[PDB]
Amino acid sequence: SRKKMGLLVMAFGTPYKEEDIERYYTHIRRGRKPEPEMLQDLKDRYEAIGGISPLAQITEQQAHNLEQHLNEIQDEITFKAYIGLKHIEPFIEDAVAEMHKDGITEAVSIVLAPHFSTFSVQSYNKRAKEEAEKLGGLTITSVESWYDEPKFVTYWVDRVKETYASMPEDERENAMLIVSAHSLPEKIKEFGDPYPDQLHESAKLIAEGAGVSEYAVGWQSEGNTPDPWLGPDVQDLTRDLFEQKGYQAFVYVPVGFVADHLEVLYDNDYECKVVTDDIGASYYRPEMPNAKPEFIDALATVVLKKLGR
Ligand SMILES: [Zn+2]
């Protein structure tokens, strides 16, 4: 009685082992293979954050955990996950092709990044749909943003209430909450990209639901190019908020991210820690959602509401 549907889970991507990093960034660097020293730098970071192997695994887990969950909270449709990544195989265009080969004719996709942006999400979705049209007999309904999904906010609000709840009285009262997402070229502004607004909105929600009056919005992991990117970067903002109001603690909630990426384990737990430590403040960073039930559930609702279920 169930209708067979495709569940296209998309994401930036992650190398599966040390030996894939070169090609991985090249693709990110748009055909520009990293210099030997930058290459050995990248390996070290990955080596530093506990290794690469666990990284990709988190995505497979989120995909198959969302698939099974969706399949038991409703009985009308039966989903079959298909991962499509941007900078590494399986690429989006293959994920869409395999689905086809499998007789899937009706699919609903979602990108593992709560916020919308023309640079990433729109790109992923348009690519997923174009590959389809090319093949034919295959339609995809794409989610664009879910950062506002109540269950996704509740997730972050509690991790925050937990973190401030564990703070020494001393700290609780002189702490700053920094909500952030992956920085993107400023130029995205001439298209009216809502990316920056939405992130500010994720801050407002989480801070509000958590009862935190003081907070700020930042950006991070910006790439290198002539044209300006979104600021202020988390490092400067931290140090800036400190020299202006000497906070004793900073709680980093990289809401733009959904898992234990390099962007979070090194750019937040290291780079930002380096600033908190330098200025004498305590570093705090709640668990990422990863593949936890509370997250997958939220993700489910996002997918079902998209389908009117
Ligand atoms: Zn990046």
Side-chain angles (χ1 to χ4, degrees):
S1 69
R2 289 192 188 244
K3 182 181 73 177
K4 177 78 173 301
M5 275 193 58
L7 176 65
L8 177 58
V9 180
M10 296 181 282
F12 201 68
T14 239
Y16 303 96
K17 62 173 176 314
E18 196 205 57
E19 299 89 334
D20 298 341
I21 300 174
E22 176 179 300
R23 243 193 164 77
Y24 174 60
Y25 281 88
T26 299
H27 199 284
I28 302 182
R29 290 171 58 69
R30 303 184 184 186
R32 281 69 165 191
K33 187 182 159 181
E35 289 308 308
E37 302 287 345
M38 188 198 287
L39 208 46
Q40 187 43 291
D41 180 12
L42 288 175
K43 290 186 194 154
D44 282 327
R45 310 206 192 195
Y46 281 108
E47 170 177 41
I49 64 175
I52 311 173
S53 62
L55 275 284
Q57 247 295 302
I58 298 176
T59 302
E60 259 290 3
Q61 200 76 46
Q62 292 173 310
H64 255 290
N65 271 36
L66 173 59
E67 168 199 278
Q68 190 169 179
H69 197 248
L70 273 159
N71 283 335
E72 61 216 53
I73 61 181
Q74 61 72 30
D75 322 312
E76 304 188 310
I77 318 179
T78 167
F79 295 100
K80 181 191 175 173
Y82 285 88
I83 299 183
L85 308 176
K86 178 72 180 298
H87 303 98
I88 200 165
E89 69 292 332
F91 294 114
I92 296 178
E93 283 84 340
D94 312 322
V96 159
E98 206 201 312
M99 291 206 278
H100 193 250
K101 175 131 91 167
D102 303 326
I104 292 296
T105 56
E106 202 170 317
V108 53
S109 66
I110 187 157
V111 185
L112 290 180
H115 308 92
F116 176 88
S117 70
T118 67
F119 182 111
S120 63
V121 166
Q122 221 188 196
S123 186
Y124 292 22
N125 288 336
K126 205 174 171 183
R127 283 171 54 154
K129 294 182 180 183
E130 304 206 312
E131 173 60 348
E133 172 173 54
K134 203 205 189 188
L135 309 180
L138 177 53
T139 56
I140 313 174
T141 309
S142 308
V143 155
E144 298 160 72
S145 87
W146 39 273
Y147 74 93
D148 55 335
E149 160 56 55
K151 290 181 171 175
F152 174 52
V153 173
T154 302
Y155 174 78
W156 274 123
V157 170
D158 299 321
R159 306 292 75 68
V160 173
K161 288 178 179 180
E162 295 181 310
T163 298
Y164 273 75
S166 76
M167 277 184 228
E169 288 202 52
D170 184 358
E171 253 173 54
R172 218 195 311 281
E173 284 204 65
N174 196 38
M176 164 57 50
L177 180 66
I178 301 179
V179 181
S180 67
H182 199 299
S183 176
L184 277 190
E186 267 211 301
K187 63 200 174 188
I188 70 181
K189 76 150 79 71
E190 238 203 293
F191 302 134
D193 201 315
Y195 190 57
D197 298 353
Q198 297 192 342
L199 174 65
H200 272 70
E201 203 138 21
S202 299
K204 192 283 179 179
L205 297 174
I206 303 181
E208 164 189 38
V212 171
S213 62
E214 298 266 53
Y215 71 100
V217 174
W219 300 93
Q220 37 161 293
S221 307
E222 70 182 57
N224 181 193
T225 356
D227 36 344
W229 287 54
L230 291 184
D233 196 311
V234 287
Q235 287 148 289
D236 311 304
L237 171 58
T238 301
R239 189 181 280 296
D240 184 292
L241 290 186
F242 173 58
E243 302 153 316
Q244 71 173 60
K245 283 199 174 183
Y247 293 105
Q248 302 186 72
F250 286 64
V251 172
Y252 299 87
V253 164
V255 68
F257 305 87
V258 288
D260 283 357
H261 295 169
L262 166 80
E263 328 266 52
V264 186
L265 299 194
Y266 194 66
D267 293 35
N268 282 299
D269 300 341
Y270 167 76
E271 297 191 296
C272 285
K273 172 69 174 180
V274 167
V275 176
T276 52
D277 266 12
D278 181 63
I279 70 174
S282 295
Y283 178 76
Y284 286 112
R285 200 274 289 150
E287 192 88 38
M288 299 301 295
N290 281 298
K292 286 190 283 304
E294 197 189 331
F295 185 55
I296 299 296
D297 181 39
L299 273 208
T301 290
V302 160
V303 173
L304 288 175
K305 286 184 181 179
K306 189 54 182 185
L307 305 184
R309 321 280 183 171

